[PDB]
C-alpha cells in the first residue's frame, strides 16, 4: 500500500513516459550530456542537463529528463559510475550507440548541487494508495 515511491527493478518498461531507443553519435569525443546516477544496480543514470553540441542536443530526440537504461547492447542498467564513465569517457569521435532510455520524468531538484546524497524527488511519480 501507499506506493508513492519510485519504482525500481531495471525494467525500461516499468519506467513511464516514453521509452525511446535513439542513436547518439559519439561526437567531439564522447557525447555531450551530463547525467546523474549510475552508481549501483539499484541506481540508474539520468540526464540532468543536455550539453549543447551534444548528440542528444543535436539529435533533438533526447532531452534532459531521459533516464539512461542501457546503451548499444551494454547493460548500463544500474552500471557502476566508474564503469559507465569508463565506457563513456573512452569512446572516440565518429562512433555510434543506441541509447535505450526512458523519459517522462521532469528534472525537479538540482542534482548539480552537491553536499548531500543526491536523491532528487521527482514529480509525475505515482502517488498510489
Amino acid at each position: 500500500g501507499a506506493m508513492g515511491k519510485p519504482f525500481f527493478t531495471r525494467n525500461p518498461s516499468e519506467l513511464k513516459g516514453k521509452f525511446i531507443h535513439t542513436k547518439l553519435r559519439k561526437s567531439s569525443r564522447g557525447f555531450g550530456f551530463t547525467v546523474v546516477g549510475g552508481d549501483e544496480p539499484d541506481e540508474f543514470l539520468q540526464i540532468k542537463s543536455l550539453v549543447l553540441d551534444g548528440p542528444a542536443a543535436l539529435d533533438g530526440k533526447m532531452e534532459t529528463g531521459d533516464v539512461i537504461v542501457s546503451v548499444n547492447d551494454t547493460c548500463v542498467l544500474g552500471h557502476t559510475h566508474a564503469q559507465v564513465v569508463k565506457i563513456f569517457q573512452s569512446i572516440p569521435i565518429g562512433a555510434s550507440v543506441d541509447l535505450e532510455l526512458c523519459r517522462g520524468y521532469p528534472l525537479p531538484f538540482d542534482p548539480d548541487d552537491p553536499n548531500t546524497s543526491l536523491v532528487t524527488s521527482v514529480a509525475i511519480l505515482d502517488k498510489e494508495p
Binding site: 564522447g30 557525447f31 555531450g32 550530456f33 551530463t34 547525467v35 546523474v36 546516477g37 549510475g38 552508481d39 549501483e40 539499484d42 541506481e43 543514470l45 539520468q46 540532468k48 550539453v51 559510475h81 559507465v84 564513465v85 563513456f88 569517457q89 542534482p111 548539480d112 548531500t116 546524497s117 543526491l118 536523491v119 532528487t120
Partner: peptide, 11 residues
C-alpha cells in the same frame, strides 16, 4: 559509506 546518491557523469 553513502549509497543513494546519483553521480555526475559528464559525458
Amino acid at each position: 559509506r553513502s549509497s543513494r546518491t546519483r553521480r555526475e557523469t559528464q559525458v
